[PDB]
Amino acid sequence: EDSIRLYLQEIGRIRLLRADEEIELARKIADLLELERVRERLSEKLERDPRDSEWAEAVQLPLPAFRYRLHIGRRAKD
DNA sequence: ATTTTGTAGCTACTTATACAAAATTCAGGAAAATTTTTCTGTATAATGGGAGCTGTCACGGATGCA
Numbered sequence: 001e002d003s004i005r006l007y008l009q010e011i012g013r014i015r016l017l018r019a020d021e022e023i024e025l026a027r028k029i030a031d032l033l034e035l036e037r038v039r040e041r042l043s044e045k046l047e048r049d050p051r052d053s054e055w056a057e058a059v060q061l062p063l064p065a066f067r068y069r070l071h072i073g074r075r076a077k078d
Numbered sequence: 079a080t081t082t083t084g085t086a087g088c089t090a091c092t093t094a095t096a097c098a099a100a101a102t103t104c105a106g107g108a109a110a111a112t113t114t115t116t117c118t119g120t121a122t123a124a125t126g127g128g129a130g131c132t133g134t135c136a137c138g139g140a141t142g143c144a
Contacts, residue, residue: 002127004126004127004128005126005127008126008127009126011126012126016125
């Protein structure tokens with residue numbers, strides 16, 4: 001019941017990385033980040049949020065691939 | 079024989095009214111002024127803590143068991 005450790009163990013069991021490895025990331029993260037602030041721009045202008053579909057981005061995208069792009073983009077940060 | 083009592087009386091004479099605006103102040107507002115609280119960034123690199131405590135009990139459990 002150490003709690004501190006009870007979490008500390010586990011984090012152990014996720015393993016450390018290196019700049020290069022954390023570079024694929026960076027891009028992806030940004031790729032997701034900005035994408036959203038589309039999502040906010042389109043928000044703020046209108047309906048308060050694209051937040052529909054492939055139009056939940058004003059951007060163009062084959063919709064399934066959108067959510068996907070989102071996943072990888074932010075999964076990087078996670 | 080004045081004096082006090084009078085009566086038949088007023089006029090002066092003064093509250094009383096009520097209003098009344100004028101004061102005359104007060105309160106609240108409004109700022110506005112400003113002071114105090116918040117917010118955000120920070121680029122070499124940095125990647126598991128602290129402690130110890132060590133002398134009843136009980137019981138019911140004790141599942142666990144061999």
